[PDB]
Amino acid sequence: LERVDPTTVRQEGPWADPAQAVVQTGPNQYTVYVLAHQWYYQPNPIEVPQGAEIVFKITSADVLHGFHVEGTNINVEVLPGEVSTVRYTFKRPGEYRIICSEICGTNHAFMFGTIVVKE
Numbered sequence: 001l002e003r004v005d006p007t008t009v010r011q012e013g014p015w016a017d018p019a020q021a022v023v024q025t026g027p028n029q030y031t032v033y034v035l036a037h038q039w040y041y042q043p044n045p046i047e048v049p050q051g052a053e054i055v056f057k058i059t060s061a062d063v064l065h066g067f068h069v070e071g072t073n074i075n076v077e078v079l080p081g082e083v084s085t086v087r088y089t090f091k092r093p094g095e096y097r098i099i100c101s102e103i104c105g106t107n108h109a110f111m112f113g114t115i116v117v118k119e
């Protein structure tokens with residue numbers, strides 16, 4: 001179990017700078033640091049290449065959230081203080097909706113993101 005401090009994740013560590021969310025970690029491998037908030041995803045959109053292995057590293061800045069990529073079997077709970085890891089290779093270019101699968105308050109019904117898979 002991989003633990004982080006939710007009260008400092010916006011200020012120190014790999015989720016602190018939103019411009020640095022996508023990091024190449026092998027010839028055809030990218031790690032993506034996703035930070036869920038009430039009520040949006042950081043970064044948005046997430047842009048990745050077709051056929052590369054993606055390693056998502058997902059945590060929460062406040063309350064329990066969900067992270068589900070429509071059209072795949074990616075569906076994880078996202079807890080403050082914990083890192084959820086998911087590995088996946090996207091074979092078809094195009095756009096996929098990201099949906100929050102855990103009730104999280106006022107604007108839960110509007111918490112959407114996007115992943116763009118480039119040709």
Ligand code: CUA
Nearest residue numbers: 100102104108
């Ligand atoms: Cu985040 Cu519902």
